[PDB]
Swiss-Prot record, chain A:
The gene is VPS72. The chain holds residues 657 to 696 of 795 of the full protein. Belongs to the SWR1 complex at least composed of ACT1, ARP4, RVB1, RVB2, ARP6, YAF9, VPS71, VPS72, SWC3, SWC4, SWC5, SWR1 and HTZ1. Interacts with HTZ1. Present with 358 molecules/cell in log phase SD medium. It is found in: Nucleus. Belongs to the VPS72/YL1 family. Participates in the catalytic exchange of histone H2A for the H2A variant HTZ1, an euchromatin-specific factor, leading to chromatin remodeling and changes in transcription of targeted genes. Indirectly involved in vacuolar protein sorting. This is Vacuolar protein sorting-associated protein 72.
Curated annotation (Swiss-Prot), chain B:
The gene is SWC3. One of its GO terms (cellular component) is Swr1 complex. It is found in: Nucleus. This is SWR1-complex protein 3. Transmembrane segments: none annotated. The lineage of its organism: Eukaryota, Fungi, Dikarya, Ascomycota, Saccharomycotina. It comes from Saccharomyces cerevisiae (strain ATCC 204508 / S288c) (Baker's yeast). Component of the SWR1 complex which mediates the ATP-dependent exchange of histone H2A for the H2A variant HZT1 leading to transcriptional regulation of selected genes by chromatin remodeling. Involved in chromosome stability. It holds the Pfam family Swc3. The keyword Transcription regulation applies.
Length: 40, 322
């Protein structure tokens, strides 16, 4: 539900700012589980 | 150096073994799956490297190192202890890092002989011309704190100062004579500035070659019938140079005179620096990328992690040796 509000925030053929790209990376990061071999 | 040769076209370069770029990192544009700084540890690696380098770097000329072990070389330890005089404990800041130091004087024997001669001259001049008060103890304490005791009265000017790290007593370095010293009376802080040349060995060796050439020419002329400054010479290789500045805090009034007397005539080094600044190549300023991609940089990430592990594994033994 909150993503739908986030979706309405998305650029709509205007002059929107870079900050969207952070959300984009958030969605992109979901692609696959993180194969972190050795914990820091 | 043996660190994994980065795959072609990475948005970073490996500087001092770590991923960095001249421009400010744009993670958001460049990384799809950025590992956390926790995951990367690049920041950690940078900090440890920084501190260690500050403990071991080339900022001050090294002069004594504890010999790596009825060998009489043991007997030399008290001799090296006595050849310096013992002085009080003072704090130093290195970039974002801070360090603590005790002070040690390098005994200039010429100052001792001249002091004996001066006492002789003063004695001969004078001969030719011819409960207990605690407040007095406080006066003597303050006088010895801002005036000079005998060892300080002889070593006012031309005394030689050695630096040592209280967290790493194994190395001793010379305080830069070619340095600008400012004593802040209000804050009791001292700022030292100096220019440093990364290929200084190249310049010194070329300088030796030129000195040999001039000596050979003079010998050839003599067969028939000098403030050599490498930085002024037209054929001197390009100095890769950096300007440096550092602040000291915690030094007491009496020591400031000794320090203030110890450094070189200012105009001469200023002119030398100006020449260095025209001829020098300045070190480029760059930005570390602390976040790496878990997929494209997996090898680099794991390599860093491994090296960090080894560093930490060694670091415990350092205190275990105490």
């Amino acid at each position: 539900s909150l993503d739908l509000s986030a979706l309405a925030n998305f650029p709509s053929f205007g002059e929107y700012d870079k900050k969207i790209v952070h959300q984009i990376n958030t969605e992109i990061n979901k692609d696959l589980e993180i194969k972190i071999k050795t914990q820091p | 150096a043996s660190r994994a040769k980065l795959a072609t076209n990475r948005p970073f370069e490996i500087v001092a073994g770590l991923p960095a770029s001249v421009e400010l990192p744009n993670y958001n544009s460049s990384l799809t799956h950025p590992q956390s700084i926790k995951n990367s540890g690049v920041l950690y690696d940078s900090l440890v490297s920084s501190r260690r380098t500050w403990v071991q770097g080339e900022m001050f000329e090294l002069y004594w190192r504890r010999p790596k072990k009825e060998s009489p070389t043991s007997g030399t330890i008290p001799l090296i202890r006595d050849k310096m005089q013992k002085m009080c404990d003072c704090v130093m800041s290195g970039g974002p890092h801070t360090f603590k130091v005790r002070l040690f004087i390098l005994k200039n024997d010429k100052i001792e002989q001249k002091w004996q001669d001066e006492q002789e001259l003063k004695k001969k001049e004078k001969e030719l011309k011819r409960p207990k008060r605690k407040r007095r103890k406080n006066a003597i304490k303050e006088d010895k704190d801002m005036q000079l005791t005998a060892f300080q009265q002889k070593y006012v000017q031309g005394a030689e100062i050695i630096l040592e790290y209280l967290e790493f007593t194994h190395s001793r370095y010379y305080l830069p004579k070619k340095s600008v010293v400012e004593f802040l009376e209000d804050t009791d802080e001292i700022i030292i500035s100096w220019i440093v040349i990364h290929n200084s060995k190249e310049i010194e060796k070329f300088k030796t070659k030129k000195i040999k050439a001039k000596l050979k020419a003079d010998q050839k002329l003599n067969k028939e019938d000098v403030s050599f400054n490498p930085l002024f010479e037209a054929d001197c290789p390009t100095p890769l140079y950096t300007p440096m500045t550092m602040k000291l805090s915690g030094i007491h009034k009496r020591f400031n005179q000794i320090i203030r007397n110890s450094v070189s005539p200012m105009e001469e080094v200023v002119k030398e620096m100006e020449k260095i600044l025209q001829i020098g190549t300045r070190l480029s300023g760059y930005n570390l990328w602390y976040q790496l991609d878990g997929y494209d940089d997996e090898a680099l990430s794991e390599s860093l992690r491994f090296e960090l592990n080894e560093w930490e594994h060694a670091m415990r033994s350092r205190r275990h040796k105490r």
